Amino acid sequence: RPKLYVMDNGRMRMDKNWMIAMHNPATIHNPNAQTEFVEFPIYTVLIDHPEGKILFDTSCNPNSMGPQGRWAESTQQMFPWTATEECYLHNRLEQLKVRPEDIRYVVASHLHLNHAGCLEMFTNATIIVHEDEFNGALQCYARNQKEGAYIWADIDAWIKNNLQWRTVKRHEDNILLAEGVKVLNFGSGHAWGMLGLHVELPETGGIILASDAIYTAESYGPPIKPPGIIYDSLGYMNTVERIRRIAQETKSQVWFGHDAEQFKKFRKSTEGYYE
Amino acid sequence: ARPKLYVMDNGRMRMDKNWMIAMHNPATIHNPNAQTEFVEFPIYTVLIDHPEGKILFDTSCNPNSMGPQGRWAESTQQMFPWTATEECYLHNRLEQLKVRPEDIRYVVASHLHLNHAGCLEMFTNATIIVHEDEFNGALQCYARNQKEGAYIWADIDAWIKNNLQWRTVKRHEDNILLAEGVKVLNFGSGHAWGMLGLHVELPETGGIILASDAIYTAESYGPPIKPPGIIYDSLGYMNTVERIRRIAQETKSQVWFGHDAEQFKKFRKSTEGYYE
Ligand SMILES: [Co+2]
Ligand SMILES: [Co+2]
């Protein structure tokens, strides 16, 4: 009988237009419309499963922010991450008496700065990632792109730590990872290659981890309100509607990438778990 | 074999620059409340007076678009205000060239947005060439009684009532040779559901590509490409821009953007002359 933990990995801020495109459009009466700098949670999920511990997303690297940080100053200033040491992934796991080395599977929803930050920790895991996302991030690396949402220093470490990669092929079916745990191949949308998770918990029932395939309940609607951070608009719309169908058909909850209200309600790792 | 191409000034529009250039000015830690700008841009149409028959690219906005009594919804008028003196109305521009709507053989609708398809209803004697996916999407807006957005219900109503003669460009259809040196380019989905361009080969001026809203401005075009906020198919949009770039390179054509203010300034308008 698995136990699922929600781990609080701090907070990030950014232009609300990244989150919800064209939220406050200029008008003839408000020609100089202003945006907001909204705050949202970064979190990860540990599924402690008989067949092996599964980790979904990894938040940000502890060495991300500041003048000796891995993130470019441009990135630090557009997407600032605020976190106490207790929020650091290694510490959240430590609190749960789980060692990095105990993780069998890490599912990378995508390789953005606030999701792939600590991949490098898990040298004993199989890292599951969409092949298109992997290819895209590696090109950023090879092209020496030191700005944007893909952190050169993070990728550098993934390679140096000799991580064990399992790429989900573009046209690959869902992957049964363990009893009641399936990796969903969302494909291109928010990013080059998005992965989700369906978890069937004996008590709680069905859970869909959407990650950045759906930022918030506002994104979800209906109607859908798409983000400014977006690669494949058609694929993004398709993915959201596909999630809506799966949720309906499997009677699952949809856990968004960073819904403040929803995260608030979650039972965090410090208080307990889901079963 | 020896045409005259005219650029017709059909007024100005204003809108949030974020529509034009996606996330042009993002907020940061030390500028959290970054503000946008209401940017003005030209609306124009192109008449190709060709021996085989007159060809019109785009139709601007309907004369009865703006105002309390206007066809455009309030919310639309506020976000996308059109300002035009009577001189700017397409029917007047054509008149000052001694061209009647009835003389137009073909209208090419780049797409069916408010500032491109506003005067389709005038050309009851023409074949209206439009992308089938754009036509389908617009008709759905109509049938769904959608009153707000960039597809004007009252305009579509008029197209149907005036019994326009339609020639849809199929999704996988090759370019169309409308006339000697005039090809309809099938750009497919991107900015909108179905985009059409034009390649014109003029004896003197050489090659011209009318991109319309496939490329808003030189800023859009880059490199680097800066996509718009008004977008349907991001991947298709990017594909189309790069395709236009290649065609321009290989055919040595100028690229005429949808609404580039600087380029528009440089144009010889219909009050001054034409391109041969
Ligand atoms: Co992301
Ligand atoms: Co348009």
Residue numbers in the entry:
A (entry chain A): 9 to 283
B (entry chain C): 8 to 283
Question: What does the study report here?
Answer:
Asp122 is also conserved and is involved in coordinating the metal cation. To investigate the importance of these residues, we therefore substituted Tyr223 with phenylalanine and Asp122 with asparagine in GcL, eliminating their role in acid catalysis, and kinetically characterized the resulting GcL variants. The alterations in GcL activity may still suggest that this residue is important, but the interpretation of this effect is complicated by the clear role of this residue in metal coordination. This could be seen through crystallization, where multiple conformations were captured: one where both metals are present at high occupancy, exhibiting an active site configuration very similar to that of the wild-type enzyme; and a second form where the active site shows no bound β-metal (or bound with very low occupancy). In the case of the Asp122Asn variant, the Asp mechanism is no longer accessible due to the mutation of Asp122, leaving only the terminal hydroxide or concerted mechanisms as potential options. Curiously, in this variant, the activation free energy for the terminal hydroxide mechanism increases substantially, leaving the concerted mechanism as the only energetically plausible pathway with calculated activation free energies within 3 kcal mol–1 of the experimental data. Visual examination of our EVB trajectories indicates that during our simulations, the substituted N122 side chain interacts with and stabilizes the terminal hydroxide ion at the Michaelis complex, contributing to higher calculated activation free energies through reactant state stabilization.
